[PDB]
Amino acid sequence: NFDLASLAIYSFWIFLAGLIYYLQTENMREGYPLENEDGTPAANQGPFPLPKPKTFILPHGRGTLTVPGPESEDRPIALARTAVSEGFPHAPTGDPMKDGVGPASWVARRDLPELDGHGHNKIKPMKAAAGFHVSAGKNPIGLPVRGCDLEIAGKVVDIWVDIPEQMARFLEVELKDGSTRLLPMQMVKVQSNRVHVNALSSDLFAGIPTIKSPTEVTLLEEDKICGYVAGGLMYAAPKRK
Amino acid sequence: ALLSFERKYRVPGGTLVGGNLFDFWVGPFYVGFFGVATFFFAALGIILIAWSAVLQGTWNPQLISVYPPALEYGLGGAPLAKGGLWQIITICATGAFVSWALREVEICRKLGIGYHIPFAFAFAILAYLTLVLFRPVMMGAWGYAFPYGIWTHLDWVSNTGYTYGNFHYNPAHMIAITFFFTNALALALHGALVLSAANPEKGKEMRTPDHEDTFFRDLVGYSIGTLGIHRLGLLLSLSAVFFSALCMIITGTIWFDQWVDWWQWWVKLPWWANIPGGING
Amino acid sequence: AEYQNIFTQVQVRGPADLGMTEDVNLANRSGVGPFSTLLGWFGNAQLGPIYLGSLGVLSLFSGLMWFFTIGIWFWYQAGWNPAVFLRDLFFFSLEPPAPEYGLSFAAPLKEGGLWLIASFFMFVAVWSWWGRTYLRAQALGMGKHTAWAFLSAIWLWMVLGFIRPILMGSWSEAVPYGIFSHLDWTNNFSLVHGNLHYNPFHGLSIAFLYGSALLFAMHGATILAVSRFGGERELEQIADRGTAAERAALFWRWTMGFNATMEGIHRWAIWMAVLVTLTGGIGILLSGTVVDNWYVWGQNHG
Numbered sequence A: 001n002f003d004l005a006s007l008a009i010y011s012f013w014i015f016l017a018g019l020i021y022y023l024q025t026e027n028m029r030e031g032y033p034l035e036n037e038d039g040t041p042a043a044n045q046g047p048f049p050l051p052k053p054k055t056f057i058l059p060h061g062r063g064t065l066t067v068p069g070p071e072s073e074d075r076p077i078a079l080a081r082t083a084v085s086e087g088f089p090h091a092p093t094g095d096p097m098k099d100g101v102g103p104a105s106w107v108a109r110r111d112l113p114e115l116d117g118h119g120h121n122k123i124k125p126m127k128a129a130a131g132f133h134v135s136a137g138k139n140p141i142g143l144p145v146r147g148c149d150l151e152i153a154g155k156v157v158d159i160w161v162d163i164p165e166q167m168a169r170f171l172e173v174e175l176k177d178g179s180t181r182l183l184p185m186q187m188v189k190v191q192s193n194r195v196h197v198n199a200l201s202s203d204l205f206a207g208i209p210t211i212k213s214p215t216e217v218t219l220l221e222e223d224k225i226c227g228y229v230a231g232g233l234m235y236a237a238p239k240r241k
Numbered sequence B: 001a002l003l004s005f006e007r008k009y010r011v012p013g014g015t016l017v018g019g020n021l022f023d024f025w026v027g028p029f030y031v032g033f034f035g036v037a038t039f040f041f042a043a044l045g046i047i048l049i050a051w052s053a054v055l056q057g058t059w060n061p062q063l064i065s066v067y068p069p070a071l072e073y074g075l076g077g078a079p080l081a082k083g084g085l086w087q088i089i090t091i092c093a094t095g096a097f098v099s100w101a102l103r104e105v106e107i108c109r110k111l112g113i114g115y116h117i118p119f120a121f122a123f124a125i126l127a128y129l130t131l132v133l134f135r136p137v138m139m140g141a142w143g144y145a146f147p148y149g150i151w152t153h154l155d156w157v158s159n160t161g162y163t164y165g166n167f168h169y170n171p172a173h174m175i176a177i178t179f180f181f182t183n184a185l186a187l188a189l190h191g192a193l194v195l196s197a198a199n200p201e202k203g204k205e206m207r208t209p210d211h212e213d214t215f216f217r218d219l220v221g222y223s224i225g226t227l228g229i230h231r232l233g234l235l236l237s238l239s240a241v242f243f244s245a246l247c248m249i250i251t252g253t254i255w256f257d258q259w260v261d262w263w264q265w266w267v268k269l270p271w272w273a274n275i276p277g278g279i280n281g
Numbered sequence C: 001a002e003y004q005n006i007f008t009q010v011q012v013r014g015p016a017d018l019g020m021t022e023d024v025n026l027a028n029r030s031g032v033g034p035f036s037t038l039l040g041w042f043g044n045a046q047l048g049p050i051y052l053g054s055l056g057v058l059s060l061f062s063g064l065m066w067f068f069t070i071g072i073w074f075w076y077q078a079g080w081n082p083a084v085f086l087r088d089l090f091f092f093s094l095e096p097p098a099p100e101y102g103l104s105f106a107a108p109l110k111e112g113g114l115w116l117i118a119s120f121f122m123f124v125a126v127w128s129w130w131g132r133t134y135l136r137a138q139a140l141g142m143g144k145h146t147a148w149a150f151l152s153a154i155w156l157w158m159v160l161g162f163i164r165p166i167l168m169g170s171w172s173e174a175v176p177y178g179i180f181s182h183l184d185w186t187n188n189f190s191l192v193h194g195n196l197h198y199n200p201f202h203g204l205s206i207a208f209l210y211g212s213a214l215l216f217a218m219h220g221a222t223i224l225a226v227s228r229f230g231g232e233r234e235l236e237q238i239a240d241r242g243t244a245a246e247r248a249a250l251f252w253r254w255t256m257g258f259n260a261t262m263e264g265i266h267r268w269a270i271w272m273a274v275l276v277t278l279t280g281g282i283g284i285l286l287s288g289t290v291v292d293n294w295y296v297w298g299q300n301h302g
């Protein structure tokens, strides 16, 4: 009453337990070891050990990533504990949108653009991407951009395109002072007579973090821009009517 | 304890009900009003399953089975030991599952992310409700629902299917299966593709998404792209579950015969039903 | 209505992307195809180029020969009548030899010989396609995960059509080439083996098939939910974790108490899917060779 099928199914369940162990440890290559809420190493790390390091050799001379490896936020974090015990929220000490915390958070990614397989910038304003054009749908260029306060924050002056994925990724929006900001495509609604942005009221557009070069955007800048805009869903909700 | 990058996200806000009253975590788990609700529904449901097991006389999880009321109860309430426990457990399960989805919504709002995950989960909840609520109500009896037991619910699948002959012939079931198989195909391919680029051949730098595109174009002549493949995985899995619900909500409500007969249409069309030869001639 | 990034709002188009060269023999790569605005609402619009090569041409040829061997059999089953052909299209079946012919290759052409011929062509078509999935990765310097995952599907197909019939001693045990007939074959298989619901490898296969839809719904929805932070750029998120990957992980950590990484979710994905046909092929291979009746077997093992 212990034949090959019995041996096979018991063996498979042992294999499956080992596979889950492997998979869980592989998924601990970021964020671990766990920390106390004051940032020191936590006593309880759970039953799965930290994976042993692996290395990625990044293309384009960008260096080498080793994970797991010593982790640091690499940025100040303007939040304060609300309770002595564990498990309660940490409250922004300043302006959470400006300080990049909560749903406004950004990560200290590389302050360089993402590159394509040929080492060129992946994202470019359409005005610098030879032959790129709107090929279907409403072209937003020239439209007014409206915030959740129903007021106009600016007008669209270019589309920033992912070249290898041929995808609109940002709208470049000119503000009343003549500077521009990038707005993530996933956070806008293109209509026939306007682009509407639920996440921001008109008065928060100038606070969108700026890019240092007019024809490229770094991964660090994208994180600051996208975090800020998404953070508006929480932090501009007093102005959403 | 926190992930090394987590503290900056653990801010107040985003709750739908209760303000800051439930706005806290237990270890990794967010609580929220719907975490409390989930706990209440799940604990009560589990308690009632334990009660049913006591009535049944077994602690064996492979034998515990909570049956719905006999068909003769129609849509009425039944005594606890005779289907009433199944009825209350089903209310608790529904409450636990919906509370779980709304807890996910609060989590989405605190994190400033889209609502796609609890929306996707709602398809699973609707498929469950198709089998224990919508179909039993349309059919006129709770006793058409499946029982809660590890093996007895499979027997319910088998008995229900074979009521209609080979259930393979249900055309919405065919569509559902095609989505489940295609979904598993797409998941294997997507996982392999990303891993084959992040973990290239030995002696090589990490590949780029352009290598992923080139690989799939070389292989089959088309690359759906990184945004497209996540849209597609969501679509295939949700469509599988949609057509699952569809293939059952019609069975026993507007279709009563052997499912193979549905196809007898195309065979018996008048301009070729009588042509000698073939299979159907 | 807030935008959900299910369908593209504004499509853009530029010069065709010719792809990476690496070590690809460009002599065997086609030219680019046209752009599809229809496809561009959901994914990329560009069609092609495609790679040809010896293995692909061999696979295409054998694959069409397989398809045509079945097709000619159907035309013969239809008396060469085009209306009987369309009418009974799903009912025709190219069947394997009867059990009396064993594993012999001498079955008359009309009584199983054509099935063997079709299967030969299908065997060459699949295994040369498998070589193609390996060599296309190798030529681009990529890992071999696609070829390895494809071998899991191949394993179930090999068990159904080749390995299990041989061990059972006749080609008659193999699956027929027909739409409805292969469904009838599947129902019959379970009835003959005492209810496949009670084959524990079939139960595992289902857990992984359901689990593959669970996981791809989770993962596809998660990436769309963080596409407002560039979340679908998974390779650069692996190389340089961004707020997309952090928020995606914390959604799941806060929901269910643990989470993945941008790389590691794709290991969960590849194993969830591969295990479907790995366990499935084991369960079928054991049926009739070792276990005649899964329900009875299960009652005596638990």
Ligand code: BCL
Residues within 6 Å of the ligand: B168, B173, B174, B175, B177, B178, B179, B181, B182, B185, C089, C157, C160, C175, C179, C182, C183, C186
């Ligand atoms: C797993 C247990 C059973 C089985 C049980 C079922 C059940 C039950 C169902 C199917 C369904 C299907 N099965 Mg079957 N099937 C088995 C083995 C196979 C094999 C094989 C090589 O072993 C093949 C080619 C098929 C093929 C197919 C398709 C006809 C269909 C959808 C498959 C799918 O989603 O693929 C995912 C892959 C893709 C999307 C890629 C494209 C696949 C192409 C389209 C397959 C073409 C096959 C054939 C050449 C088509 C001829 C069509 C016209 C007659 C010209 N089955 C085994 C024997 N199969 C469903 C159906 O609709 O049946 C009518 C269904 O309900």
Ligand code: BCL
Residues within 6 Å of the ligand: B097, B124, B125, B126, B127, B128, B130, B131, B156, B157, B158, B159, B160, B161, B162, B166, B167, B168, B173, B176, B177, B180, B241, B243, B244, B245, B247, B248, C186, C187
């Ligand atoms: C002899 C049996 C019959 C047959 C009869 C039936 C019947 C009868 C039904 C199906 C249904 C299905 N069949 Mg069929 N089927 C047969 C052969 C097959 C074959 C095959 C290869 O031969 C295949 C692939 C399928 C495929 C399928 C799917 C399309 C579908 C099941 C998925 C589903 O509904 O998910 C939907 C998902 C869910 C219901 C899950 C919901 C989960 C909830 C919301 C959450 C649970 C949380 C949990 C309690 C938490 C636990 C604790 C935590 C884990 C810590 N059938 C044969 C011919 N089939 C079913 C269907 O369509 O149902 C709608 C159905 O009822």
Ligand code: BCL
Residues within 6 Å of the ligand: B046, B049, B128, B131, B146, B150, B151, B153, B154, B157, C197, C202, C203, C204, C206, C207, C208, C210, C211, C214
């Ligand atoms: C979907 C269409 C049919 C159906 C047809 C089948 C068939 C056919 C099979 C199963 C199988 C299983 N089904 Mg069922 N099943 C249905 C409805 C359900 C529901 C539900 C609330 O709707 C649940 C919780 C389950 C749960 C289960 C597991 C016992 C098992 C593996 C599923 C799996 O891994 O899925 C994918 C999900 C995951 C990988 C995530 C983890 C899910 C875990 C395993 C759920 C555990 C549930 C727990 C034991 C019971 C309740 C919890 C406690 C009371 C708190 N089924 C309906 C009636 N199901 C297989 C089996 O082996 O059964 C013995 C099998 O062969």
Ligand code: BCL
Residues within 6 Å of the ligand: B157, B181, B184, C125, C126, C153, C154, C156, C157, C160, C185, C186, C187, C188, C189, C190, C195, C196, C197, C199, C201, C202, C205, C206, C207, C209, C276, C277, C279, C280, C281, C283, C284
């Ligand atoms: C009455 C029917 C029986 C039953 C009989 C069987 C049998 C018999 C089998 C299954 C199998 C399976 N069953 Mg069952 N099944 C029943 C009830 C169920 C129920 C349910 C709700 O009750 C469910 C959900 C399932 C689910 C499943 C799957 C988990 C599993 C098939 C996985 C897969 O991906 O195969 C599909 C994938 C493949 C077939 C691989 C194909 C790979 C090849 C290489 C593709 C070649 C393509 C070709 C060249 C054409 C190319 C065209 C190009 C596109 C151009 N069964 C009942 C009890 N089931 C299979 C299994 O593994 O069992 C353990 C199996 O053989």
Ligand SMILES: CC[C@H]1c2cc3[nH]c4c(c3C)C(=O)[C@H](C(=O)OC)c4c3nc(cc4[nH]c(cc(n2)[C@@H]1C)c(C(C)=O)c4C)[C@@H](C)[C@@H]3CCC(=O)OC/C=C(\C)CCC[C@H](C)CCC[C@H](C)CCCC(C)C
Residues within 6 Å of the ligand: B038, B041, B042, B043, B044, B045, B046, B089, B092, B093, B096, B097, B100, B104, B117, B118, B120, B121, B123, B124, B147, B148, B149, B150, B151, B153, B237, B238, B241, C210, C211, C213, C214, C217, C218, C221, C255, C256
């Ligand atoms: C719609 C596409 C697929 C899908 C999607 C999906 N499922 C999801 C999600 C998504 C997007 C989640 O966000 C959510 C999640 O958190 O996953 C980790 C979930 C989830 N899908 C789960 C299970 C599951 N999903 C399934 C299927 C699917 N999920 C679909 C195929 C299946 C099956 C059978 O195919 C199962 C078993 C859970 C892991 C999780 C939901 C967790 C949850 O609701 O937790 C709250 C409830 C409890 C902790 C316990 C409640 C206990 C009850 C009160 C008593 C028991 C009642 C039950 C009816 C008895 C059943 C007995 C069985 C033997 C039949």
Ligand SMILES: CC[C@H]1c2cc3[nH]c4c(c3C)C(=O)[C@H](C(=O)OC)c4c3nc(cc4[nH]c(cc(n2)[C@@H]1C)c(C(C)=O)c4C)[C@@H](C)[C@@H]3CCC(=O)OC/C=C(\C)CCC[C@H](C)CCC[C@H](C)CCCC(C)C
Residues within 6 Å of the ligand: B181, B182, B184, B185, B188, B189, B192, B219, B220, C059, C060, C063, C064, C067, C125, C126, C127, C129, C130, C133, C146, C147, C149, C150, C151, C152, C153, C273, C274, C275, C276, C277
């Ligand atoms: C891990 C398990 C899942 C899985 C994985 C998987 N399948 C895979 C892979 C992987 C990882 C591949 O790498 C490989 C692939 O390339 O995918 C894109 C494959 C693949 N899985 C396929 C199918 C498939 N997989 C299935 C299942 C699954 N695959 C599982 C669910 C199923 C089913 C039944 O569920 C099917 C049908 C193919 C799309 C592909 C394998 C290709 C292959 O072997 O092709 C050989 C045949 C040919 C090259 C040509 C055949 C010709 C056609 C039959 C048609 C005739 C066309 C036309 C009408 C013309 C006639 C006239 C002409 C002169 C014009």
Ligand SMILES: COC1=C(OC)C(=O)C(C/C=C(\C)CC/C=C(\C)CC/C=C(\C)CC/C=C(\C)CC/C=C(\C)CC/C=C(\C)CC/C=C(/C)CC/C=C(\C)CC/C=C(/C)CCC=C(C)C)=C(C)C1=O
Residues within 6 Å of the ligand: B026, B029, B030, B031, B034, B035, B036, B038, B039, B040, B042, B043, C214, C215, C218, C219, C220, C222, C223, C245, C248, C249, C250, C252, C253, C255, C256, C257, C258, C259, C260, C261, C262, C265, C268
């Ligand atoms: C790119 O990005 C991505 C990530 O990241 C980068 C990811 O990660 C992921 C996520 C995916 C993975 C990590 C891969 C692995 C996932 C799978 C294989 C899918 C299947 C998953 C499971 C089977 C896990 C399911 C776990 C659940 C549902 C957690 C709940 C379980 C327990 C708490 C313990 C067992 C439960 C018991 C004993 C019964 C239930 C008990 C109750 C009474 C209810 C529990 C209620 C809650 C937990 C909610 C409330 C919380 C609390 C604490 C309430 C208490 C509060 C009070 C004060 C009362 C994806 C998709 C992703 O794409």
Ligand SMILES: COC(C)(C)C(=O)C/C=C(\C)CC/C=C(\C)CC/C=C(\C)CCCC/C(C)=C/CC[C@H](C)CC/C=C(\C)CCC=C(C)C
Residues within 6 Å of the ligand: C067, C068, C070, C071, C072, C074, C075, C116, C119, C120, C122, C123, C157, C158, C159, C160, C161, C162, C175, C176, C177, C178, C179, C182
């Ligand atoms: C207009 O009409 C024309 C003539 C042009 C046509 O072409 C019409 C074409 C059709 C109508 C096509 C119809 C085709 C089908 C209905 C096909 C359906 C096929 C299935 C449903 C497949 C089901 C599963 C098949 C399996 C599992 C096959 C397994 C194959 C084996 C693993 C291979 C084993 C190899 C053997 C036995 C040969 C030995 C050879 C060696 C080299 C070892």
Ligand SMILES: CCCCCCCC/C=C/CCCCCCCC(=O)OC[C@@H](O)COP(=O)(O)O
Residues within 6 Å of the ligand: A014, A015, A016, A017, A018, A019, A021, A022, B195, B199, C143
């Ligand atoms: C609790 C622990 C229980 C253990 C039980 C005994 C062990 C039984 C065995 C099962 C373990 C199977 C694990 C398979 C992992 C395979 C990983 C792999 O294939 O290579 C490692 C991988 O990164 C390299 O792949 P890439 O980086 O993607 O190229």
Ligand SMILES: CCCCCCCC/C=C/CCCCCCCC(=O)OC[C@@H](O)COP(=O)(O)O
Residues within 6 Å of the ligand: B200, B201, C142, C143, C144, C145, C148, C149, C151, C152, C155, C270, C274, C278, C282
């Ligand atoms: C007797 C029954 C046992 C099964 C019989 C054989 C069945 C064939 C199945 C093969 C194994 C399933 C696929 C493995 C998991 C998916 C691939 C993976 O994750 O590992 C590959 C990985 O390293 C990368 O490869 P390299 O780039 O070469 O290192």
Ligand SMILES: CCCCCCCC/C=C\CCCCCCCC(=O)OC[C@H](O)CO
Residues within 6 Å of the ligand: B186, B189, B190, B191, B193, B194, B209, B212, B213, B216, B220, B221, B222, B223, B224, B225, B226, B229, C033, C047, C048, C049, C050
């Ligand atoms: C000559 C033109 C002929 C064109 C014939 C097209 C045949 C179908 C191909 C693909 C469908 C979608 C495949 C879905 C599986 C994709 C795996 C994946 O992850 O793709 C990601 C993305 O492409 C990059 O990162």
Ligand SMILES: CCCCCCCCCCCC[N+](C)(C)[O-]
Residues within 6 Å of the ligand: A007, A008, A009, A011, A012, A015, C282
């Ligand atoms: C990564 C290369 C291949 C991975 C190995 C996958 C096969 C493991 C299968 C477990 C074996 C259990 N069983 C039933 C055959 O005894």
Ligand SMILES: CCCCCCCCCCCC[N+](C)(C)[O-]
Residues within 6 Å of the ligand: A020, A024, A045, A046, A047, B028, C257, C258, C259
């Ligand atoms: C059955 C498939 C689900 C697999 C469950 C894997 C559980 C791993 C839990 C890891 C705990 C992580 N933590 C909290 C220590 O950080």
Ligand SMILES: CCCCCCCCCCCC[N+](C)(C)[O-]
Residues within 6 Å of the ligand: C105, C106, C107, C108, C109, C113, C114, C116, C117, C120
């Ligand atoms: C390209 C053909 C491939 C041949 C491999 C398959 C052999 C099957 C032979 C069928 C038997 C016919 N005959 C004449 C012996 O009756």
Ligand SMILES: [Fe+3]
Residues within 6 Å of the ligand: B190, B194, B230, C219, C223, C234, C266
């Ligand atoms: Fe992904």
